[PDB]
Amino acid sequence: INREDMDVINPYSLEVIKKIPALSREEAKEAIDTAEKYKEVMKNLPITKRYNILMNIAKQIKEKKEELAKILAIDAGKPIKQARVEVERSIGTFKLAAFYVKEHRDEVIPSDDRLIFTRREPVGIVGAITPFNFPLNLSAHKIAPAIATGNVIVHHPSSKAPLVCIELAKIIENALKKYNVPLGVYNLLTGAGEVVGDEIVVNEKVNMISFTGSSKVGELITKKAGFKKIALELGGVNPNIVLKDADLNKAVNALIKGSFIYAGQVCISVGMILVDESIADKFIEMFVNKAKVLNVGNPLDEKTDVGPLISVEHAEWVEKVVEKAIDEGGKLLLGGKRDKALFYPTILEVDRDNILCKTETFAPVIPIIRTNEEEMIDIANSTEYGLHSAIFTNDINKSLKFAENLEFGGVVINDSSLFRQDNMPFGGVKKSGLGREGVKYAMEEMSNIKTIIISK
Amino acid sequence: INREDMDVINPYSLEVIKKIPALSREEAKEAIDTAEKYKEVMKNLPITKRYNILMNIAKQIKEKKEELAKILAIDAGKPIKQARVEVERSIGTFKLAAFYVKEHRDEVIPSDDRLIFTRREPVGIVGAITPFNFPLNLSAHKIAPAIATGNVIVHHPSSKAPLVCIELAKIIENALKKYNVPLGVYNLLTGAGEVVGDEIVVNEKVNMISFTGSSKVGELITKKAGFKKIALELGGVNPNIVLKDADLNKAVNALIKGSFIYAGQVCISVGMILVDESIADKFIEMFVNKAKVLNVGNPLDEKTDVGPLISVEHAEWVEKVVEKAIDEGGKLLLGGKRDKALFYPTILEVDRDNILCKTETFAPVIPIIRTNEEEMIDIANSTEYGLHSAIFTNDINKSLKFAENLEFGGVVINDSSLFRQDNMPFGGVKKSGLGREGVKYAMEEMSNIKTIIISK
Amino acid sequence: INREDMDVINPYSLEVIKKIPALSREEAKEAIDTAEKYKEVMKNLPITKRYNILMNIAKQIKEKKEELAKILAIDAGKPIKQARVEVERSIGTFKLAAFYVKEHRDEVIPSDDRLIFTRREPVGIVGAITPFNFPLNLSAHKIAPAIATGNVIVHHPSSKAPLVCIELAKIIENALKKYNVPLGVYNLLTGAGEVVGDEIVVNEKVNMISFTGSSKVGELITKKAGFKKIALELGGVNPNIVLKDADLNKAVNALIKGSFIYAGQVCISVGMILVDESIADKFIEMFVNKAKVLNVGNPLDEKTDVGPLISVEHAEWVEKVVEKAIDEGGKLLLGGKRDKALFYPTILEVDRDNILCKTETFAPVIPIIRTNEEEMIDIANSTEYGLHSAIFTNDINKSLKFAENLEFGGVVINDSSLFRQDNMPFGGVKKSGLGREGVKYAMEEMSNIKTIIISK
Amino acid sequence: INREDMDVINPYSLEVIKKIPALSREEAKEAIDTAEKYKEVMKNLPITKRYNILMNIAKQIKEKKEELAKILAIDAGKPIKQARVEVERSIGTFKLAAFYVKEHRDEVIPSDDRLIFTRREPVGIVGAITPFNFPLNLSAHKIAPAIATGNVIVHHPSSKAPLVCIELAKIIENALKKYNVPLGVYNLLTGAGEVVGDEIVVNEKVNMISFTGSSKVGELITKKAGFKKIALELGGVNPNIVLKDADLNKAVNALIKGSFIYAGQVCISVGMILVDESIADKFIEMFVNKAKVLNVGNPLDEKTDVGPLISVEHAEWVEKVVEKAIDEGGKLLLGGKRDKALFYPTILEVDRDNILCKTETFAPVIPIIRTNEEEMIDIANSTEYGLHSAIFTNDINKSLKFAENLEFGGVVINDSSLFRQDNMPFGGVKKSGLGREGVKYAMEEMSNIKTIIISK
């Protein structure tokens, strides 16, 4: 059904881009029932066919790279340079799934009178729910491994930037036609998250939820999901630590990127910077000065470093948080300033009890805490989250100690928390999530082991 | 605690053996708080120390081998020969965790100008909840891997057979003291499961739930657990299939064991036998005849093949399921007899619709269905469960088709469903559970991955 | 160089296609010296660059697929349809090496106070020596993983079919130029194998020999290589076994392929067929009838099933072996006819004492033995070689017994010895070789482990 | 036999301890011939029996712990405390092999129409050749995995310290008797290395040579082994690098151990120390001072740090090596003296051209070169060997640069080259050897892969 129910916004011009369908809970149910009927076909789809489909998707994404990046610029406000990077990553993500279909290993276990070996089989229907920020690559990170493991897919992309997922869905439709697979094996269900996304969570016919998005929606999902496999990638306030012996020049450059890439709207964005008291002044000055020269505006402009936040309503919320932060004694050093949703790089020096140390802002808003080395781990671990952390030092013993004691799914050394190599296992501890993504790792999540025992 | 609150019953004689402590919900909360204070100590315990603790536990179990078996016989009603086997496997389980502490591999991922490697760290507190039927070995399968991965443990054992677990708790305590580790890293919480175990399920301080028991409680745990890792080993109505080309004597011997070991009170016991039409009379004759001459009586007697069911309550209820199955057209071929808790081997021929095809009796009750080959997979797959299945044939092509199409965590070829090699990955699909046990596989559930990235 | 020293022959027409350089021992020494200068550049070449180079080779091969297949037909005498298949396989090989550059995993070993991890580094100079029969894909199986593991290469191709390798060298040259890697990291050295190949084997600057070819030369290499890692893939008389219970139609069809693909000039070609006495007459009848209607002639012709042998001199030798087999009591069932190098499908019935049971002819000559089952393994195991074996049966227990007892690098059930899946470990035991190929496995051979120990 | 052919010497007192058999070439031939008769038996020994044999060996070694240690002191000259540590490691080695017989995994490879899996099978007869320095643990590292993988063993132990290998052979014979395995599966062959060892190398019935000893004999083997798998663990001159930012106290302590443990007679003993010139005098002073107070004397005395070298003849050669090093301009800082075979801790300051930089002395003789950081990698890499290297620094980037660029099988950071954890892959590159040991790795060398393909 192609109706026109819901407004899609250009976050920069605030103009309506187009209208798209918004499914009702009842239509979401129907879509799931239909998807269930195709389980047997996906389960039995030969390896070669899975490989071919995945390769073809990567091929289409490549051929439409520039179109897709423009779409990311317009719909998600993603600076075109960063947008081309997201697209190239989606290419690699589908490509890597194709090869894991061919290369995935099972095991044989020794036995005196038995041949015991394992087999991986699909969990069945994979319910994928993706966010606005990297909607192409994050969708690739769910779709590619779901297809690689013989799963049927119902997918709800973020209403905040659904257009690239719509183009990917058509790309997927295209590859399925090419290799004679009914189109019902993948299903893009657009609409209101608390309706269409929620139906996916609750519906007893979905076998696994793979969710990337807000902490609050994540935590709800654990309570509503029921008897399903659950994978969650939520946010964090990602602490990046700069010890006195850090290469300051490189630490600043790395932290400018980790702070302000996609206007700080990344689950692994710099959330707080903890800097040794003895170098704090020199760091703050260099950091502030490099952030001063960032070009802030139209994501379609090649020269643009930082574009708008996803909506006016979030920008307005961030403005409040920044106000609350100054009230608690935060010292504003840059920005704290917005035109509509275009939020300027904002830097504050705060203490450890600040609101910004407990709040993921999804914004180019960076709190710097000057501290002694002995307090750093305490402060770093003091949140409810545990996604990514980073440390800048040249000291072996200190780096080993911090790396072991930081309670996070990822610890980055001499680069910001923002780092993610796509083929690495990735995810959080504590309230930051459940399970690991990265194609090989997601494949293991999106399948069940069958143990086969042959008695001799 | 010195309290003597809750009767423990000998299922054969129905006598009280003694009274153990029954903790309140408050006492469970308080015990969980205590365990939290030792998280850092368990987390930082060196490999050599976890190895030593684990090996010393195995050593103490070996020394007390015969006593512990007697306790299984008296408390769980397990025939003494079968109890000795359970004890032996629990020894193997603790020694195997000890070796995996030292051998468990992490990985390095290639990268230009980055060193990327993984590290497993404990989930924190592991709440372990275990059943009555294999309380020593099933405890071992949660405790041993939890210790190997540096977790603190709160453990609730089944009230129906707790005494062996209390002896294991004393063994663990000795081990901990011997190697100067505080005793609060391991906690045994006895009392009512729906209070004490429920608190373990529900407490926000528990990081992971590992549950083995009933499906009713399993499903309820998925809704109550919330933000924790969840591993479930629930039951099943395990289908055992005998094709026309099977070795009959060997199939009968295998299925006798699968049906009657521990009086059918095993999550992987034979739930139904499906036998080809052309060999059905020969099979049923031979099968019934072997069942006849099994010694029913005192678990303490070396001669006993079948002992009592775990409670009178459950046995009376079993007798009701039999009468109902006869009333649906079930043909009784053996037994149906019962003295108090002691339930005699009972075999019936039924159709695919009989209540027994959909009920996990946990009793020595075996429904046998004759049918064509083309209908076997449908019947086997027709349930809500997916723990273990078994197929008896010499046909390569048929064995492969069945192994691929049987919707189960385990498929056994030319032995019954009741097979489990301890070092194999083990668990169910559908309503039969989540995640896999076996020390190596449980260790990966009971730890979280940390990805460490060094920028070169 | 640009010299025209050595005839290259069309095996079908016996005409000189062209003349290629024949390097002296001094010239091969020089190329090896030059290759040595580039070890550090290859050793330090980034993952990204190696992946690009490997993918670019695959891409150029794909674009010249037909030209390359035609060279194989004209030069190696390979039927055009089979030549297309080799080309296609060679593409997959380079592609899979590219992925393994990005994905190959190292390990971390637990230690009390140390970080212990591994790192793979090139052996240095890989000396690759390849055969006439699959010169493109077998070269790929040496070059692709050599490049993936940061080795410099010296490669001697067979003088019997060098042209496609000279085309592959130009392809490699193009990929190197495109990514700014010096040309001397790969060196094709043509000429007399006993001069040039021998120099690769003998020269102390070569770190590793990877040889595929004849037993006589392989065995010599083990005595002449000295201090280098050695990998050998020699031939064998590959026994294929047909039990009484086999699907005869599938067996015949499979065996026709394994017998007559590339006129039996493959290392894993069918060497003998052992057939149960009870089904022998029917198997022989069928096999002979299918082999009659094979189209024998010009490999450039789409119609041709079987083309000529690699040289007259070899065809002449086979004829004598066949005449010797007939003198020993062999019964001619088909063929035995020769036209220059074009040898016709030849089938004989023999006993185990017949010379053909002990001789790898590299020819479409198939000896059949009728025997009883319990003699089959003994006959199969009776040679000095042990590359591949096959067994056709629908019996689980027999297939398991035969799989375990066959002293072979590979055991194929229900297809002929000729099966090789490129991504599988491949190689032989006894005099059939040392080490395994298939890209992942070859990478392990062409690198050395470095264990790195960081004391905390 | 009961023959008394060969004097066994106590290297401290120079007394004959006893005479033992010296086999002739002919008797070595017969022992290999008998060994061959047992290939099938070993190859078919079930997992459980291999496990039981291995653990029973470990157990006997533990019960005879102190005895074996005194033997090591009396026969090998090994100080008693270091002898205990060698015994304790050998125990672990046999235990770990037992673990791996049960736990070693094979793989399954995906395929559209095939089930493809691997199986390891014994190489056949393993020829083990061991040295004098760790005759018990190094034997364990060859025998334990050889039993694990189903091989027959013929084993020549060093004539310089055979007594403990004789005791181990009896322990093995005991283990074999207990579980009804013929004694012929393991054969200890004493006598001249150039006769008995050589026949093991040359004999065509031996399938694999695992050799640990001198580079000169190792090099020989590579020319004489013929068509067998070859694994060599030779020595080297192991460079240990001390950077200006190193913890000097820790470096000194680590380097005293690495230099003087077992009087420098370990294949991974410190062969040279490279120290930054800005810290040379401080390091040299502290190092010489610590070396001064070591107790040199009788290995049986508990106080003894350094016992004698293995023979007067070797001690006399070392004396001449030291004089040559002084003649070339080396500055003697300590020692350079001997009392028969007792050689005192000897330390010299030399330049990079000194004979000590190129010679493995197997003696407590330590050359120190003061240099600049940027020449250190060149000097470390400038020998023909490549076993172990070490670097002392607290600088992350430098440790990584050195770790990557040091051409060695092992790199130790912040401990000396002597470090070996028994469960880590261990071995050298360049002339330091081939293949890796550590039980799990040795198992892979001492077995062949078999690929089994089932067509569906």
mmCIF file of C-alpha atoms in Angstrom, chain B residues 46-48 101-112 115 117-119 393-397 399 413-414 456, chain C residues 46-48 101-112 115 117-119 393-397 399 413-414 456:
data_model
loop_
_atom_site.group_PDB
_atom_site.id
_atom_site.type_symbol
_atom_site.label_atom_id
_atom_site.label_comp_id
_atom_site.label_asym_id
_atom_site.label_seq_id
_atom_site.Cartn_x
_atom_site.Cartn_y
_atom_site.Cartn_z
ATOM 1 C CA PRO B 46 43.820 -14.479 38.985
ATOM 2 C CA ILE B 47 43.467 -17.351 36.506
ATOM 3 C CA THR B 48 45.631 -19.688 38.666
ATOM 4 C CA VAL B 101 40.044 -20.744 32.602
ATOM 5 C CA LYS B 102 43.563 -21.372 31.253
ATOM 6 C CA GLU B 103 42.795 -22.114 27.611
ATOM 7 C CA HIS B 104 39.865 -19.930 26.607
ATOM 8 C CA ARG B 105 40.880 -17.928 23.505
ATOM 9 C CA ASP B 106 40.231 -14.296 22.694
ATOM 10 C CA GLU B 107 40.820 -12.846 19.220
ATOM 11 C CA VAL B 108 42.751 -10.261 17.294
ATOM 12 C CA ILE B 109 41.187 -8.490 14.309
ATOM 13 C CA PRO B 110 43.428 -7.249 11.473
ATOM 14 C CA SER B 111 43.677 -3.527 10.981
ATOM 15 C CA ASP B 112 45.905 -0.923 9.347
ATOM 16 C CA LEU B 115 45.798 -3.274 17.150
ATOM 17 C CA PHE B 117 41.780 -7.397 20.292
ATOM 18 C CA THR B 118 39.037 -8.776 22.505
ATOM 19 C CA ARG B 119 38.797 -9.546 26.224
ATOM 20 C CA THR B 393 17.957 -45.378 10.592
ATOM 21 C CA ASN B 394 20.872 -46.730 8.471
ATOM 22 C CA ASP B 395 19.815 -44.539 5.498
ATOM 23 C CA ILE B 396 22.265 -41.667 4.859
ATOM 24 C CA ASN B 397 19.878 -39.573 2.730
ATOM 25 C CA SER B 399 19.124 -39.171 8.245
ATOM 26 C CA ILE B 413 20.965 -40.469 15.295
ATOM 27 C CA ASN B 414 20.754 -44.123 16.392
ATOM 28 C CA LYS B 456 49.422 2.726 16.158
ATOM 29 C CA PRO C 46 48.771 -2.381 4.347
ATOM 30 C CA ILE C 47 45.760 -4.706 4.469
ATOM 31 C CA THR C 48 43.830 -2.214 2.308
ATOM 32 C CA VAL C 101 43.450 -10.293 4.343
ATOM 33 C CA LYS C 102 40.723 -8.356 6.142
ATOM 34 C CA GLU C 103 39.368 -11.185 8.251
ATOM 35 C CA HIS C 104 42.188 -13.575 9.269
ATOM 36 C CA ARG C 105 42.108 -14.016 13.049
ATOM 37 C CA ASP C 106 45.012 -14.122 15.512
ATOM 38 C CA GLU C 107 44.603 -15.242 19.104
ATOM 39 C CA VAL C 108 44.951 -14.093 22.676
ATOM 40 C CA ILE C 109 46.078 -16.533 25.349
ATOM 41 C CA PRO C 110 45.051 -16.146 29.025
ATOM 42 C CA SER C 111 47.818 -15.432 31.492
ATOM 43 C CA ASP C 112 47.957 -14.284 35.102
ATOM 44 C CA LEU C 115 48.947 -10.090 27.614
ATOM 45 C CA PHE C 117 48.838 -12.646 21.616
ATOM 46 C CA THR C 118 49.854 -13.890 18.232
ATOM 47 C CA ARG C 119 50.730 -12.152 14.982
ATOM 48 C CA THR C 393 26.797 -45.912 -0.559
ATOM 49 C CA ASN C 394 23.523 -45.114 1.243
ATOM 50 C CA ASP C 395 24.647 -46.978 4.424
ATOM 51 C CA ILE C 396 25.516 -44.735 7.422
ATOM 52 C CA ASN C 397 27.710 -47.266 9.212
ATOM 53 C CA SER C 399 30.268 -44.720 5.018
ATOM 54 C CA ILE C 413 30.963 -39.776 -0.274
ATOM 55 C CA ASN C 414 28.627 -40.157 -3.256
ATOM 56 C CA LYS C 456 51.824 -6.145 33.076
#
